[PDB]
Amino acid sequence: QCDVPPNSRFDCAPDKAITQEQCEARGCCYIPAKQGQPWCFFPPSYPSYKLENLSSSEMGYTATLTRTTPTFFPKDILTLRLDVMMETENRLHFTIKDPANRRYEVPLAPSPLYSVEFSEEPFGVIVHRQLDGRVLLNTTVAPLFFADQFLQLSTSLPSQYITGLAEHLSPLMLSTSWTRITLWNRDLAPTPGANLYGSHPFYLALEDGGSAHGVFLLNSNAMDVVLQPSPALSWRSTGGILDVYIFLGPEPKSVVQQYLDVVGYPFMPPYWGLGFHLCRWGYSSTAITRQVVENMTRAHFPLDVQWNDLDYMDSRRDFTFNKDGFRDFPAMVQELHQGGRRYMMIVDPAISSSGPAGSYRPYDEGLRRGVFITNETGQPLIGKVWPGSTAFPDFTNPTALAWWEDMVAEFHDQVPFDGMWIDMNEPSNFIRGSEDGCPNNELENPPYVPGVVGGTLQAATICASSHQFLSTHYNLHNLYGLTEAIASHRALVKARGTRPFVISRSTFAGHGRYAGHWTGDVWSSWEQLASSVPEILQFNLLGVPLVGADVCGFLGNTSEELCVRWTQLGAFYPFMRNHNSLLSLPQEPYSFSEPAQQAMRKALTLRYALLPHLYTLFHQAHVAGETVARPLFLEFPKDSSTWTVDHQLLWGEALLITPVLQAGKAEVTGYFPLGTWYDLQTVPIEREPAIHSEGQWVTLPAPLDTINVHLRAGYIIPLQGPGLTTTESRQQPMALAVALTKGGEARGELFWDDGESLEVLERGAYTQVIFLARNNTIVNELVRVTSEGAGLQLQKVTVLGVATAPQQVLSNGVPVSNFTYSPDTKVLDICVSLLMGEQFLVSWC
Numbered sequence: 001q002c003d004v005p006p007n008s009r010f011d012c013a014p015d016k017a018i019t020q021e022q023c024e025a026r027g028c029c030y031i032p033a034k035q036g037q038p039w040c041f042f043p044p045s046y047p048s049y050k051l052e053n054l055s056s057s058e059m060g061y062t063a064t065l066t067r068t069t070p071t072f073f074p075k076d077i078l079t080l081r082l083d084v085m086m087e088t089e090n091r092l093h094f095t096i097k098d099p100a101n102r103r104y105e106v107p108l109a110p111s112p113l114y115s116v117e118f119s120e121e122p123f124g125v126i127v128h129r130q131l132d133g134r135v136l137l138n139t140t141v142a143p144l145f146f147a148d149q150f151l152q153l154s155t156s157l158p159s160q161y162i163t164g165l166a167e168h169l170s171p172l173m174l175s176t177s178w179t180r181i182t183l184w185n186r187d188l189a190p191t192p193g194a195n196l197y198g199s200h201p202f203y204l205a206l207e208d209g210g211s212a213h214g215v216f217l218l219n220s221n222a223m224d225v226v227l228q229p230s231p232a233l234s235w236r237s238t239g240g241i242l243d244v245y246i247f248l249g250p251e252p253k254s255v256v257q258q259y260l261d262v263v264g265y266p267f268m269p270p271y272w273g274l275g276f277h278l279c280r281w282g283y284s285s286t287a288i289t290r291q292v293v294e295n296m297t298r299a300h301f302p303l304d305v306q307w308n309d310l311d312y313m314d315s316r317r318d319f320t321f322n323k324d325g326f327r328d329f330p331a332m333v334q335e336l337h338q339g340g341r342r343y344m345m346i347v348d349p350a351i352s353s354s355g356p357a358g359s360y361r362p363y364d365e366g367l368r369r370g371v372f373i374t375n376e377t378g379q380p381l382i383g384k385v386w387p388g389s390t391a392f393p394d395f396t397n398p399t400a401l402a403w404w405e406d407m408v409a410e411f412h413d414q415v416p417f418d419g420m421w422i423d424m425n426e427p428s429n430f431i432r433g434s435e436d437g438c439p440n441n442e443l444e445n446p447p448y449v450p451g452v453v454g455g456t457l458q459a460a461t462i463c464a465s466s467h468q469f470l471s472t473h474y475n476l477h478n479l480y481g482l483t484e485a486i487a488s489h490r491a492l493v494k495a496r497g498t499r500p501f502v503i504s505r506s507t508f509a510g511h512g513r514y515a516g517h518w519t520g521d522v523w524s525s526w527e528q529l530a531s532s533v534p535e536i537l538q539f540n541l542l543g544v545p546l547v548g549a550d551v552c553g554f555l556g557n558t559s560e561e562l563c564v565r566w567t568q569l570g571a572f573y574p575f576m577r578n579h580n581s582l583l584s585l586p587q588e589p590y591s592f593s594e595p596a597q598q599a600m601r602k603a604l605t606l607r608y609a610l611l612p613h614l615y616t617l618f619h620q621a622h623v624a625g626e627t628v629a630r631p632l633f634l635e636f637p638k639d640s641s642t643w644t645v646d647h648q649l650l651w652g653e654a655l656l657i658t659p660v661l662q663a664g665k666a667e668v669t670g671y672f673p674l675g676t677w678y679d680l681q682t683v684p685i686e687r688e689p690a691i692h693s694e695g696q697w698v699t700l701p702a703p704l705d706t707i708n709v710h711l712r713a714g715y716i717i718p719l720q721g722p723g724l725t726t727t728e729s730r731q732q733p734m735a736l737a738v739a740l741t742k743g744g745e746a747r748g749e750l751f752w753d754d755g756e757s758l759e760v761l762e763r764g765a766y767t768q769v770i771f772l773a774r775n776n777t778i779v780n781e782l783v784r785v786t787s788e789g790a791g792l793q794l795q796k797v798t799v800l801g802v803a804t805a806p807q808q809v810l811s812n813g814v815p816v817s818n819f820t821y822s823p824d825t826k827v828l829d830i831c832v833s834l835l836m837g838e839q840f841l842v843s844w845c
C-alpha cells in the first residue's frame with residue numbers, strides 16, 4: 001500500500017504538523033524523507049469520491065460523485081455533481097458542484113483535439129491529446145477533496161515545464177521541486193516565495209516536442225497551488241467550486257489565445273499610452289511638476305504623459321487637490337494638453353471617513369448610497385490608509401459603480417486627467433482587518449490557511465467576513481482590484497468618451513480586458529532589473545500585455561549604470577514608466593551625466609520610432625489574443641533550448657531583444673533560434689550586421705550605450721519619424737525596415753486608426769496594410785483603407801540582406817531620387833515618396 005515513489009507522494013497532512021500515529025490514524029502512510037517531500041502521504045487506496053450514474057448529453061457528460069468516508073477536514077460535501085462540456089474543438093470545460101446548495105461562483109478531420117475518460121473509483125478525469133495520445137490531465141493521481149472551505153484537485157503534468165500562476169517573483173518556468181504557490185492578493189514589495197498583488201489561476205504546460213495545453217481554474221478564493229517533481233500539481237482552494245477549463249493549443253500561442261477567448265482579449269490602449277510616462281512620489285507642487293516636463297523637453301527626451309502620486313491631493317484624499325502646491329492644478333493639466341501631452345494621477349480605493357459630515361462628498365455621498373463594504377453590524381468597515389481612517393468601496397455593488405462614475409466625472413470637470421493609476425487595490429490596509437478588529441468565525445479563521453505572508457487572510461487587508469453586494473470578502477478578495485479596474489474603465493469611458501487608460505496594481509484573471517498593470521514596489525537593483533523580464537513575459541501570457549516595471553526601480557537609490565541598462569530594457573516594456581519612491585534620489589533621464597543621457601535618449605528614440613509596430617502588436621493582442629512581449633518559447637516551441645530562456649524577449653514574432661542585466665558587463669550572451677537575425681543598428685534611425693544562427697547561444701558586444709536588438713529575416717517593420725510626444729510623432733513620415741530571407745522574402749503589416757476613439761474595429765474606422773517583399777520587389781496590399789491612415793507618407797525603405805549592389809532602384813517604375821547601398825552591411829537604403837494607403841511597387845536589380 002505505502003510503496004509510493006518519493007516524488008509521487010501527495011501530502012496527507014497539508015493542514016498541520018503530524019505524528020506517525022496521527023498520520024496512520026488518518027489512513028495515510030508515514031515514511032520520513034531521507035533528507036518539501038511529505039512524510040505523511042495518501043496510499044493509492046485512500047478514500048476519494050466514486051463516480052456514479054455517468055450519462056451523456058448533447059453537451060458532453062453528467063454524473064454524481066459520492067464520498068463515503070469523510071476526510072480530516074470539516075464539512076465534506078459527500079454528494080457532488082460533475083458536468084463535462086465539450087465546448088469547442090480546443091476547449092474542454094468541467095465543473096464539480098454541490099447539487100444541494102448554490103455555492104459561490106466567480107461573477108461574470110472534424111473532432112476535438114482532446115478526448116476524455118473517467119476513472120470510477122477513485123474518481124478522476126483523464127484528458128488525452130488525441131493526436132499523440134499524451135496524457136495531459138489525470139486527476140486520479142490523488143483524492144478529490146471537496147469540503148465547504150477546502151477543495152483539492154490534483155493532476156499529473158506532462159513535463160517539468162510549467163508557467164503561470166501569477167503574481168510571484170520567479171523564473172518564467174516554475175520550479176516543480178515541492179513548490180507552494182499562493183494566490184491571495186497582497187500589498188508586498190516583490191520578493192520570492194510570496195503572494196503578491198494579483199492572482200491568476202492559470203497555467204500553460206509544455207509537452208515534449210513543443211505542443212502545449214493550458215488549464216484555468218475559475219476560482220477566486222485564497223488558494224495554494226503545489227507543484228511536485230513526479231511531475232504533478234495540486235489545486236488547493238479555500239472555497240467556491242471546481243470550475244476547470246482545458247485549452248488544447250497545440251501551439252503555446254494558441255493556448256494563450258484560447259484562454260483569452262474565455263477571460264477576454266486585451267483592451268486596445270490609446271496610442272499615447274505607448275509613449276514614455278514619468279512619475280515620482282514627491283513632485284510636491286505644480287511648479288516642480290512643470291519643471292519635469294521643461295527639463296525633459298530641454299534635453300530632448302520624449303515624454304507623452306506626466307504623472308503625479310499622492311502629492312496632488314488635499315490631505316491624501318481622492319478627488320481633491322491641495323490649495324498650496326497644487327492651487328493651479330487645473331491650469332497645469334490644461335497646459336499639458338496644449339503642449340500635446342496627457343496627464344495621469346494616482347487614485348486609491350479607500351475613502352476618508354473621518355472628516356466632518358457634509359465636508360467630503362466622496363464619503364458623504366458614498367454613505368448615502370451604501371457603496372462601502374460593511375461589517376457584522378452593517379456599518380462601513382473602517383481601516384487605516386493614507387488619509388487616516390477610511391471606508392472601502394464595494395465594486396461589486398452596482399450603486400457603487402454609479403457613485404464611482406460620478407466621483408470620477410465630477411473630478412474630471414475640475415481637472416481633465418486622461419486616465420487613472422489605481423493603487424493599493426488588493427485592498428491594502430495599514431492595520432489588520434479593521435480599526436475594530438474582525439469577529440471570530442470560520443471565514444476569519446478557516447480550517448486551511450494558504451501560505452500567505454503573515455499567516456492570516458486579514459494580514460495587510462480587511463476582514464474576510466466583511467460584506468459585499470455579491471458575497472463575502474472571503475470569496476471576492478482576489479477580485480477587488482479587477483472590480484475597481486472594471487469600474488474605472490467604465491467611469492473613464494463615460495467621463496471622456498474615448499479609450500480608457502487604467503494602470504492597476506492588483507489584478508485577477510481577465511484583468512487585461514479592462515486595464516494594464518505595473519509590477520509594483522521593485523527595488524532599484526540589478527536583481528530586480530533581471531526579474532522584470534520573466535514577469536513582463538508572464539503577464540503577457542496571462543492576457544495583460546500592457547505591463548511594465550518602474551524603470552530604474554522604485555525602492556532605494558538607482559545607480560547611473562543601472563538606470564542606463566534599465567531604460568534600455570524598459571524601452572521594450574509594453575508599458576514604459578519611470579517611477580520613483582519618496583525618499584529616493586532623482587532618476588529622471590535628465591538628472592544623469594551627459595553620456596548616460598545620450599544612452600537613455602537613444603533608447604527612447606528607438607521606442608518612439610517603433611511605435612507604429614508596437615501599436616500594431618497591441619491591435620493583434622486585442623483582435624486575436626496574441627501576446628505583445630513574448631518569450632522565445634512561444635515563437636519557437638519546437639526548439640527545446642528556448643524553453644528556459646526568460647532574460648531575452650521578443651516583440652511579436654520578429655524583434656529579439658537581448659539586454660545586459662548585470663553591472664560591469666560590456667557583452668551579453670543570448671539564444672538565437674535557427675534563422676538569420678539582422679542587427680537593428682544597421683537600420684537608419686533619426687558587430688556583425690547579421691547573425692546566421694543554427695539555433696545557438698551567441699555572445700554579443702554590449703557596451704554601456706548599447707542594447708542588442710535583432711530583426712528576424714522574413715519580416716517587415718513599420719516605423720515613424722521622431723517627436724517628443726506621439727502627438728508630434730504621429731504626424732511624421734513613415735519608413736519600412738525589410739528583413740529579407742535568403743530567398744528574398746518578407747512580410748509584415750501596419751494597423752492605423754485615430755489613436756483614441758472607441759469602437760474603431762466595429763465602426764471600421766481604421767486602415768490596415770500588409771507589406772510583402774519577393775523577387776526584388778516590395779509591395780503593399782490594402783486590407784482596409786479609410787480616412788484615418790489613407791494619407792500616411794512613406795518616405796524611406798531600408799532593405800536588409802541585399803547581397804549585391806543594385807544598378808537601379810525603381811519606385812512605381814521610375815528611378816528613385818536617392819538610394820545608398822553598403823557592401824559591408826548588405827543594407828539598401830531607399831528614399832521614396834509613397835502613401836501607405838495606395839498600392840505601390842518598389843524594385844531593384
Ligand SMILES: *[C@@H]1O[C@H](CO)[C@@H](O[C@@H]2O[C@H](CO)[C@@H](O[C@@H]3O[C@H](CO)[C@@H](O)[C@H](O)[C@@H]3O)[C@H](O)[C@H]2NC(C)=O)[C@H](O)[C@H]1NC(C)=O
Pocket residue numbers: 375376377378379380381382436437
Ligand atoms: C462596524 O463598523 C463600525 C464603524 O462603521 C464600528 O463602529 C465603531 O464602534 C466602536 C465601539 O465598538 C466605537 O468606538 C468607541 O468610540 C467612542 C468615542 O468615539 C469611545 O467613547 C468608546 O469607548 C469606543 O472607543 C467607534 O467609534 C465606532 N467607529 C465609528 C467610526 O463610529 C463597529 O464597531 C463595527 N462593528 C464590529 C462588530 O466590528
Ligand SMILES: *[C@@H]1O[C@H](CO[C@@H]2O[C@@H](C)[C@@H](O)[C@@H](O)[C@@H]2O)[C@@H](O[C@@H]2O[C@H](CO)[C@@H](O)[C@H](O)[C@H]2NC(C)=O)[C@H](O)[C@H]1NC(C)=O
Pocket residue numbers: 052053064066
Ligand atoms: C443512480 O441512479 C439510480 C436510478 O435513478 C433513476 O433514474 C435516473 C435516470 C433518474 O431518472 C432518477 O430520478 C431515477 O431515480 C438511483 O437509484 C434509484 O434511487 C431512487 C431514489 O433513491 C429510487 O426511487 C429508485 O428505486 C432507484 N432506482 C434504481 C433503478 O435503482 C441511484 O440512487 C443513483 N445513485 C446515486 C449515487 O445518486
Ligand SMILES: *[C@@H]1O[C@H](CO)[C@@H](O[C@@H]2O[C@H](CO)[C@@H](O)[C@H](O)[C@H]2NC(C)=O)[C@H](O)[C@H]1NC(C)=O
Pocket residue numbers: 044122126135138139140141
Ligand atoms: C492516471 O493516474 C492513475 C493513478 O496514478 C493511474 O492508475 C494507476 O495505473 C497503474 C499502472 O497502470 C496501476 O498499477 C494502478 O492500479 C493505477 N492506480 C489507480 C488508483 O487506478 C492511471 O494509469 C493514469 N491513467 C493514465 C491514462 O495515465
Ligand SMILES: *[C@@H]1O[C@H](CO)[C@@H](O[C@@H]2O[C@H](CO)[C@@H](O)[C@H](O)[C@H]2NC(C)=O)[C@H](O)[C@H]1NC(C)=O
Pocket residue numbers: 288289291292295588
Ligand atoms: C530641472 O532642472 C533645473 C536646472 O538644472 C534644476 O534646477 C537646479 O536645481 C538645483 C537643485 O538640485 C539647484 O541647486 C540649482 O540652483 C538649479 N539650477 C538652475 C539653473 O535653476 C531643477 O531642480 C530641475 N527640476 C526638476 C523637477 O527636475
Ligand SMILES: *[C@@H]1O[C@H](CO[C@@H]2O[C@@H](C)[C@@H](O)[C@@H](O)[C@@H]2O)[C@@H](O)[C@H](O)[C@H]1NC(C)=O
Pocket residue numbers: 555556557583584585
Ligand atoms: C538614498 O540616498 C539618500 C541620500 O543619500 C545622500 O545623498 C546622496 C546625494 C549621496 O551623496 C549619498 O551618499 C548620501 O548619503 C539616503 O539618505 C538614503 O538612505 C538612500 N537610500 C538607500 C536605500 O540607500
Ligand SMILES: OCCN1C[C@H](O)[C@@H](O)[C@H](O)[C@H]1CO
Pocket residue numbers: 280281309310346423424505520521554579580581
Ligand atoms: O503605501 C504606498 C502607496 N503607493 C504604493 C505604490 O506601489 C507606489 O507606486 C506609490 O508610489 C505609493 C504611494 O502612492
Ligand SMILES: [Cl-]
Pocket residue numbers: 018019020021
Ligand atoms: Cl513522530
Ligand SMILES: [Cl-]
Pocket residue numbers: 113129130131211248249250
Ligand atoms: Cl493536438
Ligand SMILES: [Cl-]
Pocket residue numbers: 103104470471472475
Ligand atoms: Cl455567496
